[PDB]
Design an enzyme around this catalytic site. Structure first.
Site, PDB file in Angstrom:
ATOM      1  N   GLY A   5       1.616  10.201  -4.176  1.00 14.19           N
ATOM      2  CA  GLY A   5       0.494  10.998  -3.663  1.00 14.19           C
ATOM      3  C   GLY A   5      -0.516  10.149  -2.904  1.00 14.19           C
TER       4      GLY A   5
ATOM      5  N   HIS B 141       6.256  12.623   6.845  1.00 15.08           N
ATOM      6  CA  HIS B 141       7.085  12.992   5.680  1.00 15.08           C
ATOM      7  C   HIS B 141       6.346  13.962   4.756  1.00 15.08           C
ATOM      8  CE1 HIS B 141       5.590  10.412   2.342  1.00 15.08           C
ATOM      9  NE2 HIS B 141       5.626   9.327   3.140  1.00 15.08           N
TER      10      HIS B 141
ATOM     11  N   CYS C 120       0.196   8.390  -0.173  1.00 18.67           N
ATOM     12  CA  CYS C 120       0.571   8.316   1.214  1.00 18.67           C
ATOM     13  C   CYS C 120      -0.511   8.968   2.064  1.00 18.67           C
ATOM     14  CB  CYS C 120       1.930   8.943   1.477  1.00 18.67           C
ATOM     15  SG  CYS C 120       3.306   8.032   0.705  1.00 18.67           S
TER      16      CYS C 120
END
EC number: 3.4.19.12
Lengths: 305, 305
Positions: free
Chosen positions: B143, B41, B145
């Protein structure tokens, strides 16, 4: 979202840990530039620890009696000196992994990370507070002495703790990196009792702010109080007195959340008087006091190093 | 003595964190050998996350659209591929800090350390369990991830988790390093509800053994039980069923302490039925389930890396 007891990343400190052996005693040292810092009781047997005369024990020691190993490589000791309760072993090689660093003496209520080590090798990292009775509640086995506590400011490690002693009650005592004990403790195996382990009120309030930011709001009530009123209740529950200096430090969390510090004090007073009634806050059934207001801002804003 | 929620030392993993940017999205990647692993993603806007077609979004992407930065140095991307829910970015430089490593898919109830990162830079380290509903209760901001979960076996890092999603309820979901989600979760911003978050019974028993080893013994009672009896009570309190496999894993802690596993089960049953009555165990007012039997042995024996 979520809120965790978080340690600093440990790599900068892992790079500084070494093994120090004197005779039959092995513990940990901290290698910064061309100095290794370790507990002076490296020179003691368990027998010596009952009533050690460190100056007299040190007369019998030369540079070559201090064995320092960094990984599986032996460092050459070219000088030694005692400063308060630490030894400083001068080596002929500067640690190539030396980070930017400072030595700081922390206040009661301040938090730090511990890198628990054995034989110069890291075992684990966890977050501690300096208790108001100048103990820490750590996880330290035989051979952990010389493990350190620290904080990081971007790329700079502030070393604040070196582990020396387990008290008979199973709590922990140690020094700053100038070798001065926190509290009245000594590096002798003798009767040493800690005073009252009070709760760090400003940290509890910080953590309640953390809980609100994370949507855990059930404990917020309709009340306010005054510093003097709140402190009468705090004293009864063995909480540290809250000062205007603490109120000022909580200002940014007050501003974020729109909850006046004294309103949060009145929420905390009701939690002290009523208990939790089997409910939890940020997954805890106790009021957590190991997060400073700086910790809560840091974790809630995603600060990196 | 003392017992702490302890993370693994983080340095080996700090050495592997990088920043990955695709268009306006920046998150973390894991750099091992000449591959960077990150959440697929990274290619999505927040708008795309409502209903992403990853194959179709990826058609529009070339190697040069994936910006990878390691410290303040830019890596050259020479290939990319999607494996399940991760991207693999092939770079032209092997990470010189690559540790010995494995990719492992953990079981519910297993614990691991998380190195929370933003913009490729470490913020903090903490210990997690994989919940029985395949969520984790982390501390992850926008942020984070691409931050990873891991275990260390001496010098070998077993990577078990990469962070992808916060559910609407504020718990966390992610993948193994082959990009397969734990649980039924998907990398889409849609209605995803977790199932029952049951207590990890074998871990609670391990922690009660830890408490005994540390002198916290008030909760030990005069009773025993059977697995079937204990499980009827466990099911009522949303505890996982205890199996003979779990009893076998607790054998070494049973042996150390001289408390038969079923005797400890009967102590736990009374704690479930009676509560704590305002008392604590290892400083907790709740029964802790984030320590495995291996964790307790490790911390109680001072294992290093």
């Amino acid at each position: 979202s979520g809120f965790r007891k978080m340690a600093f990343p440990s790599g900068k400190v892992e790079g500084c840990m070494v093994q120090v052996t004197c005779g039959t005693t092995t513990l940990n040292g901290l290698w910064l530039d061309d100095v290794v810092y370790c507990p002076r009781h490296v020179i003691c047997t368990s027998e010596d620890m009952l009533n050690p005369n460190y100056e007299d024990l040190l007369i019998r020691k030369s540079n070559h009696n201090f064995l320092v190993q960094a990984g599986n490589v032996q460092l050459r000791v070219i000088g030694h000196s005692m400063q308060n309760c630490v030894l400083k072993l001068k080596v002929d090689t500067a640690n190539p992994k030396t980070p930017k660093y400072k030595f700081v003496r922390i206040q009661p209520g301040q938090t730090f990370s511990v890198l628990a080590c054995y034989n110069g090798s890291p075992s684990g990292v966890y977050q501690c507070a300096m208790r108001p009775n100048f103990t820490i509640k750590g996880s330290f086995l035989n051979g952990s002495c010389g493990s350190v506590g620290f904080n990081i400011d971007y790329d700079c490690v502030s070393f604040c703790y070196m582990h020396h002693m387990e008290l008979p009650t199973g709590v922990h005592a140690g020094t700053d990196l100038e070798g001065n004990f926190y509290g009245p403790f000594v590096d002798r195996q003798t009767a040493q009792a800690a005073g009252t382990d009070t709760t760090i009120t400003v940290n509890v309030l910080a953590w309640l702010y953390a809980a609100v930011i994370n949507g855990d709001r059930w404990f917020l009530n309709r009340f306010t109080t005054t510093l003097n009123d709140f402190n009468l209740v705090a004293m009864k529950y063995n909480y540290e007195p809250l000062t205007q200096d603490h109120v000022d430090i909580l200002g940014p969390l007050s501003a974020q959340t729109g909850i006046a510090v004294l309103d949060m004090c009145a929420s905390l007073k009701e939690l002290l008087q009523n208990g939790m009634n089997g409910r939890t806050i940020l997954g805890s059934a106790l009021l957590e006091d190991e997060f400073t207001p700086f910790d809560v801002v840091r974790q809630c804003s995603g600060v990196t190093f």
